[PDB]
Amino acid sequence: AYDTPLGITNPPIDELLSRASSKYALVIYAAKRARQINDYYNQLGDGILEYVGPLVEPGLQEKPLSIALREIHGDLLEHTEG
C-alpha cells in the first residue's frame, strides 16, 4: 500500500494515468471537466447546453478540479482524443 494521500496528492497519479493516454491527456481530461462542473453550479451552459455532474458525492467545499480528478479515478467518464 501507499498509506493515504493528503489533499492534492489524492488520487495518485499512477491510478489516474491508467484512465488516459499520457499525463498531458490527463490534464485536459480533468481540466475541461472542471469547467463543466463549475458551469453546472452556475447557469450552464447559457444557450443550448446543460451541465452534468458532479457525478461523485462532492466534498464539503471541494474544488471542481478536485472533483473531476475523483470522477476520472472511478472511470465515471470516458474521453476521446483527437
Partner 1 sequence: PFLEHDDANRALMGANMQRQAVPLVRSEAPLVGTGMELRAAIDAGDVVVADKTGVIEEVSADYITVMADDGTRQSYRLRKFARSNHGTCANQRPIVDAGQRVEAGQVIADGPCTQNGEMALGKNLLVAIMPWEGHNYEDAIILSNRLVEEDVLTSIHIEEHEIDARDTKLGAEEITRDIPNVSDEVLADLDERGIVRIGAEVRDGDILVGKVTPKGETELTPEERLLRAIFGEKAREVRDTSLKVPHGESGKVIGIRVFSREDDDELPAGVNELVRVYVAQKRKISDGDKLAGRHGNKGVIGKILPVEDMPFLPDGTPVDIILNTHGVPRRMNIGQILETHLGWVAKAGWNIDVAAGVPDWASKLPEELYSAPADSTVATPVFDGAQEGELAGLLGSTLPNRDGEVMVDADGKSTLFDGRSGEPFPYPVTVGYMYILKLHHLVDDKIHARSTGPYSMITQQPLGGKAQFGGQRFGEMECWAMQAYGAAYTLQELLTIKSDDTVGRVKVYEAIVKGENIPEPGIPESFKVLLKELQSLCLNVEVLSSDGAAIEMR
Partner 2 sequence: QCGLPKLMALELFKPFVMKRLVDLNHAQNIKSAKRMVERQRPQVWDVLEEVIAEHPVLLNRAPTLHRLGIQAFEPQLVEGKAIQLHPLVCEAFNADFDGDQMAVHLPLSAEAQAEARILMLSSNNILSPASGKPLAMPRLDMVTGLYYLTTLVEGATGEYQAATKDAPEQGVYSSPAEAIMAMDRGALSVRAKIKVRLTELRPPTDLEAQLFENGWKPGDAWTAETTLGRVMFNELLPKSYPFVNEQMHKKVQARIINDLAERFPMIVVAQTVDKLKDAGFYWATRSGVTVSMADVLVPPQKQEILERHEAEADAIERKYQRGALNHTERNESLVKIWQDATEEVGKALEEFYPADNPIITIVKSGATSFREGLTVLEYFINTHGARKGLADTALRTADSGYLTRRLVDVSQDVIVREHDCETERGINVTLAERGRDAHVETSAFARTLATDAVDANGNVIIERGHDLGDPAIDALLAAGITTVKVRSVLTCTSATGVCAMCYGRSMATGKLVDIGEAVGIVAAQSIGEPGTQLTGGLPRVQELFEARVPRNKAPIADVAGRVRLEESDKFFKITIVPDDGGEEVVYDKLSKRQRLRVIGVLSDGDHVEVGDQLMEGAADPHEVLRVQGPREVQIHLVKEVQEVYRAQGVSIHDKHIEVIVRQMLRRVTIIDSTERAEFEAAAGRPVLMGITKASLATDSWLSAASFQETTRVLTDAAINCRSDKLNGLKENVIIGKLIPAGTGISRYRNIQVQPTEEARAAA
Binding mask 2-41 for partner 2 (x = CB under 8 A): xx-x-xxx--xxx-x----xxxxxxxxxxxxxxxx-x---
Number of residues that bind partner 1 (CB under 8 A): 8
Q: How many CA atoms lie within 13 A of 28 on its CB side?
A: 10
Binders of partner 1 in range 21-60 (CB under 8 A):
24, 27, 31, 35, 38-39, 41-42
- Residues 34 and 68: beta-carbon distance below 8 Å: yes
Nearest CB to partner 2, comparing residues 44 and 64: 64
**Cell 476520472 appears where?**
72
